[PDB]
Design a protein around this ligand. Structure first.
Ligand SMILES: Nc1ccc(C(=O)O)cc1
Ligand SMILES: Nc1ccc(C(=O)O)cc1
Ligand SMILES: Nc1ccc(C(=O)O)cc1
Ligand SMILES: Nc1ccc(C(=O)O)cc1
Ligand SMILES: Nc1ccc(C(=O)O)cc1
Ligand SMILES: Nc1ccc(C(=O)O)cc1
Ligand SMILES: Nc1ccc(C(=O)O)cc1
Ligand SMILES: Nc1ccc(C(=O)O)cc1
Ligand SMILES: [Fe+3]
Ligand SMILES: [Fe+3]
Ligand SMILES: [Fe+3]
Ligand SMILES: [Fe+3]
Lengths: 102, 491, 305, 81, 102, 491, 305, 81
């Protein structure tokens, strides 16, 4: 259970984006909107697991810039296949976060 | 100009009122609502974190389907059916059969909440949930339908839940328990929280990874799009959980989560486990079943469970050991009794595969490998009679799946039995027996396939009688080795 | 014994149709497995609480037919086509909202109309949510998937109407912040006489658990009353008060309401294949109509005050 | 006719094996082995024994199931001395 | 030029449908709506060349029946990649035809 | 209720009027309109057979793009770039470079008609035509753009038409002649009728067949969707043709068709011919270049030309012989001078391929095979200096393509020369010389690459000087053998 | 000599942007190769007829800028997003048509309004087609693709308006078959005084072949006049005559018209980077304004008759 | 310096070969062969000759291009006797 213990004791939060036109822009957006956080990316081809420690923010403005076309925050649902963390969403951004530190 | 959702959203869920012409309990009966005596006013604190609204829903969901269907259309001639490894085709057959009409059943889980939850936000989000599951059931009938003309086993995408075939009974016993057979709050906790943030990621995203590796983009694109809906409506569970805890019902909440997670595990171990470690071609295995479990269940789900304020399940250590062991035995059972399946199990034990299995599960060859050694031998010697069963496996009274253990060098197997109201029941784990004991009225008079066979309900009492009882309608429909045993040639 | 058979061109249950199965047939038909075993709808103990519930409120309904599954949505709507249709209608309604706001429609309504709206319109969110809850109940209890599907779409339409009302309540309050818009609706629904017939009607309707009575009360009695006694009078009043938006909005809602009545009538036609059902249906209508008529009189009396 | 559930040493599952009320722990062990040995378990030397599932005590090789006091559908193991 | 002469002296008319959901339904529609005409189909994977002698009609009603979903005639353009013959189109049908007989 | 298009459509094209404040000729100048003196009233007979209207257009075209883009998105990870035969990648590079900005140019052809055609129906259909070509130019920039980060040769999707690279000059000399450089009626006949019902089916549907065989569904799905627009706006040509014939201008119409078809042929022979018979992997060749020609040009197009009342072109027999021979030589030229291309030509002469070529073109090995024998030898002996050119090919003054013939056993090559205004010009066929003589003011002062080189415009006068002049910006961009000569190993 | 270089993240010409290239940048920028060679726009004889045309009417325009290509549609519209936007607006307009027809709008207009429409509205199809032809000319002559793209969309919008007019002319005639609707428009455009200022304006405008004069006359002079002197007065008249559809339709058309003015102003701002252009632009406006004002007076005089 | 266009026997194209005003039909034939033989044409025995394109008459092996009356950029063939 040392492997299992180490797996459980993480604070990784962030979107899992299904393969498509949002993968690259979301990764770039994660890097830009969370400066001084290390963004990790695990590529499973059909989806990509994007994470930061404790909190990871995606702003509508940056995502729109990185995607290169007009974009409303609610559209992220077309490609947000799952996520780690609790979610806080509005018209300007989505925030993935944990209340606890493990 | 248009006004932003945040400014009018509260009015969409300002729908609770104080009943006057019937009582609160008549309007929200406990057996359907499961409010555990928590008064209406407390439920208005419920705050769904993944909101949507009707105009956005229809627009967004239209876009989701346009992509799913366009992709299917553009790839009809990719010859997935003709050119794919038959193990991959069986993965599709198994998935669609075990899932399509179950999705449609989930509409009823969402509807139970839409009508009977005391939380106004939950009733609205369940309404989109009803719509989502309708989408999912219709997609997963529409997609396999084109393959009917190619293969009768694809008819089971529709037929499975109408049959008494063993995996269909296992699927229905589980879904009827956590989706359609309980009160709204139980559904919120067991379905939307436990099952849907807990395990469905495995089957709909883990499998999509393997599908992409296999080059089946129609399917990967399909199921990954489906899970985008889950990501939203699954978020009805957490806030019910938090509300129960705030109102002194943490023990009740913990027990429901504990029960649902284990029930889901046993079913996923028999369907997704063999798919990921055996049916899916070796070169297409993005990760092993265990690795996916550690990603999705341990690393993501259980961490979220802790964040919300719940505890690891009491059976944590048993669960971890099970991850190492259970599905290997389930695979063996599904394959040995393959003729009762509606898909064609791949044995998946060529030397190259056994090397991978040993690397992913050290000690495999000294365990399951011992049985496959015997099996492989009979095949290399045309004793095909020894590779087909002449009796029934002993079946769990909870999960409806055979009672298994670890074979080979360190043989170890345990059945957990229970006398109850004069009847003897058998369970494949402490947890399954515990689940029964949590709610006997739910389970006590259910009879599994073995029980029915011994009670004389299956006639004639022979392999053919059972296959008839299970709803098979032609020879072609019955499961066989995926590669017609051609894997023996690598041995 | 067993035979070897050719692949079928469609699902085994549709293989005898003398027409090629449509998208609707393929994805909609015969999906309730819970109707297969009379003794045990769900795959649990046959006397589990939900099994007893279904055996009483579905299986034992006096509304009887040997083949409910043969019912067909006259519109043959599926999820995909529903969203296409409603994205069309809803984009149009939202465009109206945007355009009429741009032109400051609300400022030009007859003096005091804001008070009539706060009393007679905004609390509709409660009524429409009741329709939403009730539609979901019929969904979960109906004996055929083709019936349940109509109910699912109807539940969504009910939320659609609820949402229109919430949006416009809030919007109207931006021009008329001293009329109680978005503040006093619950109290009106609970205490105002004009709303009490409707509230009593729905509270009792929501406690009619037999699937057949639920369907008849909701779709044959309550919902047509709402069309004739709430929707259409509101349009007339709006016209008399220089509200040009509400009549357009309600015309869009009326399209949904006719659709609900259209599939309801088709279910009735199907059920009336059994001559016994005429008396059953007729009895439930007579049972509920007085409550419906009283709800309408109280509302109209209030609208005219 | 007497149904039991039997777990054979080194196999991976428990199976329904229908024995007779008059069989001895030599006959029962034989009927179980039939659905196991040379199917998923390699044949071996030694004497096949029957015990109540997970029990420490073995049934005498000569006792009948009737004499054993076992109830139908109860679980037994079959192991080697 | 005997090969070329034989290629030119045809009266084949009909739609070329690009790969997608209209391929099968258009072929079935061609067969149904032109009874007593032999429908030929050449499959090039990315498209299918569907033809009859002299004239080939596709009615909206039959196409809608064979496609299995609501369908307006103008939508055929989404998948009509080319055609042989002159075209005559309206809300009820499309007709492919030649004025001459070669 | 809504009223059907047939009831109000005439009003959409009731837009002709009798000018009073300027003259008819000032409003429709012959040089831009090309009405050939036919009065306004006669043009109102123009009846476009493939109609659409604004509301249907935006709705339908929205649906077309949603599918094109969704498919591209779902397949980004199919590793077409990494896993495809490099001959296939070069096919993409060639296509996008030679086409994207040409599509955008076609907007101007459509615009010329939208403003200057005397037929009201033509002006409206050209308006949708402008929109269609805008779509096509934008699609075919957007799609290859993602590959910029992988390969600089993909930059030519945008750069090509801005360069003086030889194929870009050939493309522009053709498109500027039939699309942007002539009056509206000429555009209707040369572009929408001749080129667009005549040849584009080959490149956009013939190639799509090969793409589907190659498993590149993003591309096949893309170009086949593009051609659905062509099918509609190309139908502006036929009714102009019929109107010219009815009004005594059949000779003028025939000559324009004759000219445009031949000009298109020479360009297609140098781009599509080598792609279909050499670059496209052998297993992906749905049909040979000739077979596709017989399907699309002879069987479909020329039959339609006859049906409308025109005659086979005077050069019919030369054209047929050319189909057997020309592209084989063009391929050889493109490959030998590969360093001046922006894609990497595949030689496509492994023994297996030569067998296919001999079967598709009997006598090939005794002809082009003789040259490839010599080439193959130098490669097997590392005399790579003999496999790169040290001079220029002689270039046609019409098509801008090298002057070729049949090599080998029955060697035969003919250049057709012309003195005009004191200058000597050279053409690769009787037809090309005939085209020049039809309209000398269009062509006489144009200088091809060889002319410019001899006039001192290309400095330094060396291979590197020419490559610089052609707009190459790095070593990577210059064309090389697709397989780095690995095909020699099959020899 | 030549160097070995890394792949660029975007087209070579966009590689120096300090922002990631958008969809708009990628598919819209620097697509006119015909501006590369001053001596020979097109790849033909340098003195071919179309080369001479372009050298005179584009290259030699007095409206001068060293970098026309740097122009940006302030909306950054591409084909894909144009269709999304206009399918939205057009679905809404078509829904209005359907809904107002259902409610028999046309029967309820003030007596004689049908005659005012037949005289003042239906012949707009000719005016709008002129705008369509003229927009296409600016498209084909503009010195940058980003400019031409705006013109392409504007040509489509002009056909959109033309189509609205055709549809409504026909529809109105179904209620008023004795007013000459769909029959006498050409004669009105040709002979009616109220139309003669407009017809003279457009006939002359369509013969202004310099790309710069074409642009200024069309987008800075003619089109704003139409907004202020045709579109808005029509709305007022419709209001006075109980026509509630036309004001809504025109509001949708006005959205297109503001978009055209928006990109036009942005081009002017770009051009005014060259101080010389102020006098050029100002001169063309003064040249054309009198014709525009006279066209408007004649039309308004007729509308008020 | 004298540019001509030359088609070499059995090759597939015509190429620009720049010869000198003083070269003989032996030197010209040599300069052409350079860009052909051992590149796309197999070497062979015999004497290389020069003729005006498609002409029946061959230029004397000794005549210079100046004496031949050829104009620059005119087309010639190079064949074997
Ligand atoms: N089989 C099933 C598939 C999906 C779901 C669900 O999303 O809730 C439930 C059951
Ligand atoms: N899970 C099961 C597997 C097989 C059988 C059976 O063969 O009867 C029953 C149950
Ligand atoms: N005699 C029998 C043998 C096997 C089975 C079964 O696997 O279900 C049933 C009867
Ligand atoms: N859910 C159940 C279904 C069937 C039986 C049975 O056939 O005995 C028992 C329980
Ligand atoms: N390169 C080109 C591509 C397409 C077209 C066209 O469709 O007219 C024209 C030129
Ligand atoms: N078509 C051409 C091919 C090559 C060259 C050249 O190398 O200069 C010029 C033209
Ligand atoms: N010396 C030279 C050799 C070859 C070329 C060319 O192929 O363009 C140009 C100059
Ligand atoms: N269209 C032409 C372009 C360039 C030249 C030249 O450079 O001489 C000639 C013609
Ligand atoms: Fe689901
Ligand atoms: Fe779900
Ligand atoms: Fe095009
Ligand atoms: Fe085109």
């Amino acid at each position: 259970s040392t492997l299992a213990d180490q797996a459980l004791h993480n604070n990784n939060v962030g979107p899992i984006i299904r393969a498509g036109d949002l993968v690259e822009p979301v990764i770039e957006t994660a890097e830009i909107d969370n400066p001084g956080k290390e963004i990790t990316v695990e590529d499973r081809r059909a989806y990509v697991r994007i994470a930061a420690e404790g909190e990871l923010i995606l702003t509508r403005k940056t995502l729109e810039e990185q995607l290169g076309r007009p974009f409303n925050m609610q559209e992220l649902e077309i490609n947000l296949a799952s996520f780690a963390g609790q979610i806080q969403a509005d018209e300007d951004q989505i925030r993935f976060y944990f209340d606890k530190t493990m | 100009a248009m006004h932003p959702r945040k400014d009018w959203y509260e009015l969409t869920r300002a729908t609770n009122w104080t009943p006057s012409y019937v009582t609160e309990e008549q309007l929200f009966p406990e057996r359907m609502s499961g409010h555990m005596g928590i008064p209406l006013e407390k439920w208005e604190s419920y705050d769904e974190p993944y909101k949507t609204s009707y105009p956005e829903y229809v627009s967004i969901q239209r876009e989701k389907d346009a992509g799913a269907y366009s992709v299917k259309a553009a790839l009809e001639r990719a010859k997935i059916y003709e050119n794919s490894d038959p193990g991959w085709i069986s993965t599709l057959k198994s998935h669609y059969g075990a899932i399509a009409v179950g999705e449609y059943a989930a509409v009823t889980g969402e509807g139970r909440m839409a009508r009977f939850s005391k939380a106004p936000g939950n009733r609205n989000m369940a309404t989109f949930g009803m719509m989502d599951e309708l989408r999912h059931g219709q997609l997963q009938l529409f997609f396999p339908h084109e393959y009917c003309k190619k293969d009768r086993q694809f008819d089971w995408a529709w037929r499975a839940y109408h049959s008494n075939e063993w995996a269909a009974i296992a699927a229905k016993h589980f879904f009827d328990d956590i989706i359609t057979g309980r009160d709204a709050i139980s559904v919120a906790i067991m379905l939307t929280f436990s099952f849907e943030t807990g395990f469905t990621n495995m089957q709909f995203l883990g499998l999509a990874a393997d599908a992409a590796e296999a080059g089946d983009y129609t399917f990967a694109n399909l199921i990954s799009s489906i899970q985008t809906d889950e990501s939203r409506h699954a978020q009805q569970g957490g806030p019910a959980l938090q509300l129960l805890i705030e109102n002194g019902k943490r023990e009740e909440a913990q027990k429901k989560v504990d029960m649902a997670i284990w029930r889901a595990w046993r079913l996923f171990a028999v369907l997704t486990g063999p798919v990921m470690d055996y049916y899916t071609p070796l070169e297409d295995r993005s990760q092993s079943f265990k690795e996916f479990m550690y990603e999705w269940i341990i690393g993501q789900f259980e961490r979220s469970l802790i964040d919300l304020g719940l505890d690891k399940p009491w059976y944590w250590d048993l669960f971890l050991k099970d991850i190492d062991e259970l599905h290997h035995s389930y695979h063996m059972g599904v394959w040995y009794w393959r003729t009762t399946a509606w898909w064609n199990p791949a044995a998946g034990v060529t030397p190259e595969e056994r090397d991978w299995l040993e690397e992913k599960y050290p000690g495999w060859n000294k365990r399951w490998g011992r049985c496959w050694d015997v099996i492989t031998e009979n095949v290399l010697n045309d004793r095909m009679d020894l590779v087909s069963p002449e009796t029934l496996p002993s079946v769990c009274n909870m999960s409806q799946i055979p009672l298994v253990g670890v074979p080979g060098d360190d043989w170890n197997i345990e059945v957990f039995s229970l006398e109850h109201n004069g009847r003897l029941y058998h369970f494949g784990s402490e947890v399954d027996r515990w689940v029964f004991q949590q709610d006997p009225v739910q389970y006590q008079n259910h009879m599994n396939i073995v029980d029915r066979f011994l009670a004389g309900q299956i006639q004639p009492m022979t392999l053919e009688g059972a296959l008839k009882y299970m709803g098979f309608q032609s020879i072609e429909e019955m499961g066989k080795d995926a590669h017609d045993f051609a894997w023996a040639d690598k041995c | 014994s067993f035979e070897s058979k050719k692949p079928m061109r469609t699902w085994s249950h549709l293989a005898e149709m003398r027409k090629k199965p449509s998208e609707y047939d393929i994805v909609s038909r015969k999906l309730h497995y819970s109707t297969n075993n009379p003794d045990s709808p769900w795959e649990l103990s046959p006397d589990s609480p939900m099994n007893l519930w279904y055996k009483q409120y579905r299986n034992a309904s006096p509304l009887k037919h040997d083949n409910w599954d043969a019912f067909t949505d006259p519109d043959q709507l599926v999820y995909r086509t529903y969203n296409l249709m409603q994205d069309g209608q809803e984009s149009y309604v939202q465009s109206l909202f945007d355009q009429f706001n741009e032109r400051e429609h609300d400022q030009m309504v007859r003096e005091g109309w804001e008070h009539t709206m706060a009393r007679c319109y905004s609390p509709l969110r409660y009524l429409f949510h009741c329709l939403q809850m009730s539609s979901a109940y019929v969904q979960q209890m109906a004996p055929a998937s083709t019936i349940s599907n109509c109910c699912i779409l109807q539940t969504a339409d009910s939320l659609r109407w609820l949402t229109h009302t919430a949006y416009r309540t809030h919007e109207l309050s931006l021009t008329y912040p001293d009329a109680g818009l978005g503040e006093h609706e619950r109290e009106l629904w609970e205490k105002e006489p004009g709303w009490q017939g409707l509230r009593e009607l729905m509270e009792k309707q929501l406690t009619a658990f037999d699937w057949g009575e639920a369907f008849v009360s909701l779709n044959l009695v309550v919902k047509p009353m709402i069309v004739e006694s709430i929707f259409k009078p509101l349009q007339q009043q709006a016209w008399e008060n220089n509200d040009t938006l509400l009549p357009l909005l309600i015309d869009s809602q009326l399209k949904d309401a006719e659709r609900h009545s259209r599939w309801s009538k088709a279910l009735v036609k199907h059920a009336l294949e059994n001559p016994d059902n005429h008396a059953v249906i007729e009895g439930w209508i007579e049972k509920w109509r007085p409550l419906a008529d009283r709800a309408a009189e109280a509302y109209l009396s209030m609208l005219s005050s | 006719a007497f149904p039991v559930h039997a777990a054979f040493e080194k196999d991976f599952l428990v199976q329904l094996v229908v024995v007779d009320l008059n069989d001895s722990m030599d006959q029962v062990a034989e009927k179980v082995a039939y659905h196991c040995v040379n199917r998923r378990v390699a044949p071996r030397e030694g004497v096949m024994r029957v015990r109540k599932h997970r029990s420490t005590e073995l049934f005498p090789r000569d006792m009948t199931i009737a004499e054993s006091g076992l109830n139908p559908t109860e679980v037994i193991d079959v192991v080697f001395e």
